[PDB]
Structure 1
Amino acid sequence: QHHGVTKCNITCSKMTSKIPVALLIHYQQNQASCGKRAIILETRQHRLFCADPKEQWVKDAMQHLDRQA
């Protein structure tokens, strides 16, 4: 669609690679309006980071996060 109508607020340039699995406090799924598959990670430092969804370690991080809180 056009620009006036957009529910995408997150754009990722790069991805975080591997660590760690304990620093995370919450995670958010990227908006559909973005059209780009990405995961948002909020750590204990209240810092946000981009992470590629199709990663072996990501699927293992979301596990601990979803199970814990």
Structure 2
Amino acid sequence: MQHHGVTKCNITCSKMTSKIPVALLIHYQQNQASCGKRAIILETRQHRLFCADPKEQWVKDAMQHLDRQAAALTRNG
């Protein structure tokens, strides 16, 4: 907050999200060390970019899931 602009990082994990059906997730990114809270980035087919904590179960499995999805179809990760 120097003078103009009240933002901070395109995707900052200020808090944690709620449980969401893995069937809605399409991709999962990672929080930037220069963005906000070191969490996880969840992207859904509906352009849903939320920040979930790695501890969250739905996230642990959600990840192990997409791990065997991206590869499929197109083997160009």
- TM-score norm. by structure 1 comes to 0.73
Q: List alignment gaps of at least 5 residues for structure 1.
A: none
The percentage of counterpart residues that share the same residue type is: 99
Q: What's the offset of the Cα at 1:34?
A: 3.9
- TM-score norm. by structure 2 comes to 0.66
Is the CA contact (8 Å cut-off) linking 2:40 and 2:51 kept in structure 1? yes
Is the CA contact (8 Å cut-off) linking 2:14 and 2:37 kept in structure 1? no
What is the RMSD of the two structures over their aligned residues, measured on CA atoms? 3.7
Q: Hey, what's the Cα distance between the residues in 1 that align with 2:56 and 2:22?
A: 13
Q: What's the offset of the Cα at 1:2?
A: 17
Please say which structure displays the higher CA radius of gyration.
2
SS of residue matched to 2:51: strand
Is the CA contact (8 Å cut-off) linking 2:53 and 2:59 kept in structure 1? yes
Q: What's the offset of the Cα at 1:30?
A: 0.9
SS of residue matched to 1:33: coil
Q: List alignment gaps of at least 5 residues for structure 2.
A: 70-76
Is the CA contact (8 Å cut-off) linking 2:24 and 2:44 kept in structure 1? yes
Q: What's the offset of the Cα at 1:50?
A: 1.1
Moved beyond 4 Å, runs of 4+: 1-9
Between stretches 12-21 and 27-36, larger displacement belongs to: 27-36
Q: Hey, what's the Cα distance between the residues in 2 that align with 1:14 and 1:45?
A: 20
